Structures are given as C-alpha cells and as structure tokens.
Amino acid sequence: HYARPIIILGPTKDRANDDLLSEFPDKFGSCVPHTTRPKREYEIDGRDYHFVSSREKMEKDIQAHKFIEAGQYNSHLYGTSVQSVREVAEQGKHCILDVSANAVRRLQAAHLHPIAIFIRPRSLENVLEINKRITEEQARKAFDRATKLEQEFTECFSAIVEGDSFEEIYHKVKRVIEDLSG
C-alpha cells in the first residue's frame, strides 16, 4: 500500500538500479518529471512530463522546496517533484531514484522515509573489481567521490554495504530493501 523510495549511492549504483528494476518489474517504479517547456505534439502530459504551462509557478515551487532536483536547459526548467515521487510511493511501488545525497536529505525532510543505501568501496582496487567496465582514470574519481560522500552524508544512509564482487554488493542491497520494506 505504501513503498519507500530507494536511492542507491556509491559506485555500481546505476547497475544495481538497473538489475533490481530488471528483476522485479512489478515491485519498482519510476516517477514522472516536470518541465516548463511547451509539450510536443506526440508528447503526453502526465507520462513524458507534467508540463507546467505557467513557468512562474514552477520557479516559485522550486523556491518552496517542492523539488528534490532541478536545472535549466534551453531556458526551460526541469525537475523531479517531491509529490511526483510520493505518487509512485502510493501505488505500492518502490521509486528508484538517480539523485544526489542532498536530494536524499530533502526526501527525508519531507518525512517521505526513503531507503538510502550507500555502497562503500573498500579500496581503489575494489573499485576496479566490483565495477564491470571502467578504466583506472575513472576509478580514482569514483573512489575519491565515494570517500568524501560518506564523510559528509553518513547520517542520512539507511545502510552501508560492501563486497569484493558486485554480486555480493547486489545481494546485500536486496537484503537492505528486504529488511526495511515491511
């Protein structure tokens, strides 16, 4: 009846999202973004985007802390609303989110109660192992971003998981969701 949105953080998160999405189609869902850009002919409001005809209203709502993530392109605003994520939460679907940890803090300030799982790399070498495709260049930036991000945002994670293989990481991610979904 109510399922908590999920944000996986750390290396390999996107693939954890993909494989969980790809493994339980019925359990996980996706939220619908907003856009102040005029809707296209073959675009569908409520499915491609909630199209805001009043751009002024969406700017004010962003300033009212109703979006967890936002940006501007070709003079148009795009964002994922606080309310659009709950709309998935009410269908009994877990909302898989590609959002920052600040965005996580904002879903908690809502009281939405989301599942924030952080994947801690053991070492730079662990980055190269748990991660299927990557070069040594990219691995350092990933290892250095994960270490700063835990030192800054530990207090907001529902769990921290580790593994020498991604399958071990992926299994513990499902263990977290399984313990905290009841």
Binding site: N17, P33, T35, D48, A70, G71, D98
Partner: peptide, 12 residues
C-alpha cells in the same frame, strides 16, 4: 535515471 537527454542536461 531519466531516460531523456533534456532532463539530464538540465541537471548538469
């Protein structure tokens, strides 16, 4: 993640 380039560019 949002499967639309426009949204991704906007958040960048």
């Amino acid at each position: 993640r949002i499967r639309r380039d426009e949204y991704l560019k906007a958040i960048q």
